[PDB]
């Protein structure tokens, strides 16, 4: 009977671990956007240099 609660806690742990994935995606989106913006800023800076 003691195994059951452990199983349930394992499931809750699975969901809690399943949230961090979407969290991580939402995170990395900002990194990608930062990369693109960095590229644009680089090009713009080159143009300013011209």
């Amino acid at each position: 009977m003691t195994d059951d609660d452990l199983d349930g806690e394992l499931v809750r742990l699975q969901e809690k671990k399943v949230q961090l994935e979407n969290e991580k995606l939402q995170k990395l989106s900002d990194q990608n956007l930062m990369d693109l913006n960095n590229i644009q800023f680089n090009k713009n800076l080159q143009s300013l240099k011209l």
């Binding site: 003691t2 195994d3 452990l6 394992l10 742990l13």
Partner: protein
């Protein structure tokens, strides 16, 4: 042959009155071994978890 059958009844009575439950406790002991093994498996699963 009938007397031999009575002797067979005496032999059956001998084998029956020989011993009470013994190996049954060994089966229950095997079940207990399965319980301890399940404890090791649950402890391992707890370790991995």
């Amino acid at each position: 042959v009938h007397e031999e059958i009575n002797e067979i009844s005496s032999k059956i009575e001998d084998d029956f009155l020989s011993l009470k439950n013994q190996n049954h406790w060994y089966m229950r002991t095997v079940q207990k071994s399965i319980e301890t093994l399940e404890k090791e498996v649950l402890q391992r699963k707890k370790s991995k978890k």
